[PDB]
Ligand SMILES: CN(C)c1ncnc2c1ncn2[C@@H]1O[C@H](CO)[C@@H](N)[C@H]1O
């Protein structure tokens with residue numbers, strides 16, 4: 001499989017302007033007729049090169065003449081000797097029932113549905129399957145009326161009919177030109193939740209959420225969230241929906257999350273279906289996020305699309321930024337920022353230190369489905385956020401507005417977007433552009449000096465990015481470095497120099513620089529990289545007391561949390577080293593006291609307290625180390641929990657009880673109280689065994705919502721409480737028929753600290769609720785084991801690696817996209833000790849040798865073994 005390169009982009013030799021599709025739908029044999037209107041832009045002698053995969057070609061006509069000047073080649077239909085302008089007619093057959101990869105037209109249960117991003121449309125017909133070819137679609141769908149009463153495509157219905165032999169048809173037209181990755185088709189029998197949204201200018205939009213029969217009870221929150229998304233995009237960004245109908249279809253079989261097909265989004269049901277007994281607060285807020293995200297793409301992705309796939313972050317960085325801003329405005333901004341930074345530092349930085357490292361605008365791709373990454377998405381969004389930091393809201397929105405004025409109805413590049421921001425704001429983003437081309441995490445080192453003679457405070461700030469596997473050369477970035485200086489009372493010291501204010505966002509643009517501040521009347525405590533102002537590792541020699549000072553006094557809630565993270569990091573590192581020498585946890589009294597103070601502080605937001613009382617995950621902890629010792633990290637996390645449980649027992653139980661809520665509401669203040677209560681319950685579970693067992697079992701049985709029930713169940717498994725096996729069986733007996741609810745239970749099984757977790761997981765391959773045909777079940781059992789139980793995955797006997805190789809050997813053939821997601825923990829081998837590296841390398845070597853190795857896995861495996 002051959003790599004493609006960004007620098008190789010060239011405008012297409014032919015465009016398509018209009019495509020009329022007819023589907024004669026059948027799960028075993030679907031016939032596609034595609035009539036395209038084409039224009040040659042390149043040389044007269046250049047053939048038309050159409051992409052296609054696993055298609056049975058029936059016929060090729062050019063202006064209704066059966067064509068003889070063509071050939072099929074791997075992946076392609078090459079058509080020669082064409083006029084400058086012509087009508088192409090292709091007829092071909094495809095087989096949805098055989099499509100286990102879930103790419104193209106496939107079956108989800110009894111429904112037929114599509115996934116076309118990135119390159120799935122070529123699995124449906126021969127086409128210019130590249131996102132700089134925009135065309136107007138018309139789609140006619142013919143099917144059995146009893147099996148497929150609903151026949152959906154993008155846009156509005158223009159024609160409908162009934163045929164003999166129980167077939168019917170519907171034809172759709174979408175006026176907006178689109179690249180083919182935004183094509184969608186759905187056929188099936190559904191319950192339908194119908195609502196309306198009226199835009200601020202008065203356009204009434206019909207909203208339609210399509211769910212499997214008997215799931216309407218789980219649909220209102222998704223609808224609520226759609227309307228919220230629409231309203232917010234109007235309020236914040238000034239953008240209105242542009243069509244008459246907005247359709248969402250929830251399907252159970254889906255490799256991604258959800259997909260922004262124009263006017264006909266297709267969602268994994270995990271990101272739609274919720275009711276209070278089936279879904280947690282986090283589920284509710286994730287549905288809100290993903291509903292938002294796909295809606296937001298209607299502008300950032302659909303009305304302006306991507307010139308080529310290397311520009312994916314153009315839509316994904318900006319749409320994730322928008323989803324974050326949406327959640328943050330509606331909810332707790334600080335809890336959002338905290339959890340997005342946890343993702344960045346715990347998951348994204350690992351990718352940027354791995355063999356799959358890439359810039360947010362990649363330069364080299366083998367399989368584009370491998371580049372829907374933490375980097376492109378979440379780091380992408382941090383890059384957008386940095387532009388927002390540099391410009392301010394008002395200039396940022398002027399940039400947005402210039403971007404749409406210039407590029408609406410076209411396919412654009414990341415550079416176009418930056419230029420629009422630069423030109424609208426008059427802020428120079430030339431250096432800033434290097435964030436798009438350079439991979440890896442910058443390390444920002446900060447030293448400080450306070451001169452009492454002159455009342456000056458000096459920060460000496462250096463940067464460097466280490467080389468990564470993909471790039472041997474690195475250069476300094478334009479790093480927006482936000483600070484705040486605090487006096488001995490906790491009050492912010494005004495920043496100034498030579499009699500003038502200085503902006504608190506420092507422009508860290510060199511390898512080394514100094515910043516001098518005047519009229520600093522007291523030695524300050526600095527808050528550095530405020531709100532995570534750039535996606536970098538910060539090196540500052542913090543005292544413990546500077547960090548507890550910030551926890552008490554810092555103005556922004558994020559800074560209070562971040563200071564707690566910096567204080568814990570020192571002691572996580574200390575205790576991992578101790579664990580490797582067989583020595584028990586050591587924690588200063590003053591550290592425990594800082595967490596006690598947070599528990600008893602009446603003035604702190606409970607949302608913030610809960611996050612400070614949520615220890616860094618085993619992933620966030622791994623980021624603190626060059627070489628990862630996953631057993632030490634897991635055991636240190638447990639011991640730290642037990643230590644705090646003991647030291648803070650009385651305070652934890654008081655706050656647990658104080659935050660009891662008898663009514664359940666999906667409302668942010670309520671959520672905050674509940675997160676705090678369950679944060680306390682986690683520590684209590686790791687306390688004295690009898691009290692723990694009582695508290696946890698009672699919460700599980702008495703809960704009136706899934707948040708509380710699952711928090712108890714997860715604590716029983718994490719602390720290996722007596723009640724665990726009863727409660728787990730209880731859950732299975734109640735919920736086994738409900739795959740989305742059972743996913744939570746598979747995750748708890750896979751992430752268990754029990755010694756026999758792998759045996760349990762293997763046995764669960766045969767569980768009544770598990771199936772290898774469903775990506776959500778696969779992720780929830782196998783994925784969670786490999787990725788979220790690094791202590792068991794990395795068992796010294798190598799059993800974890802062997803288990804993953806077995807599963808990958810199936811999935812490589814069945815569903816390469818899911819396989820490539822699941823191989824990630826093995827490609828991290830260079831972070832582990834030699835003995836583990838040797839076992840992981842052997843596992844990788846085994847997979848490299850598979851018959852019919854997918855491109856998706858080939859790419860990762862070859863990088864890993866280099
Ligand atoms: C370790 N890997 C592959 C991932 N770990 C966690 N989240 C991921 C990962 N790969 C992609 N994502 C998320 O998928 C979403 C897009 O499908 C992005 N939001 C990205 O974070």
Ligand SMILES: [Zn+2]
Pocket residue numbers: 293297315316319320
């Ligand atoms: Zn997206």
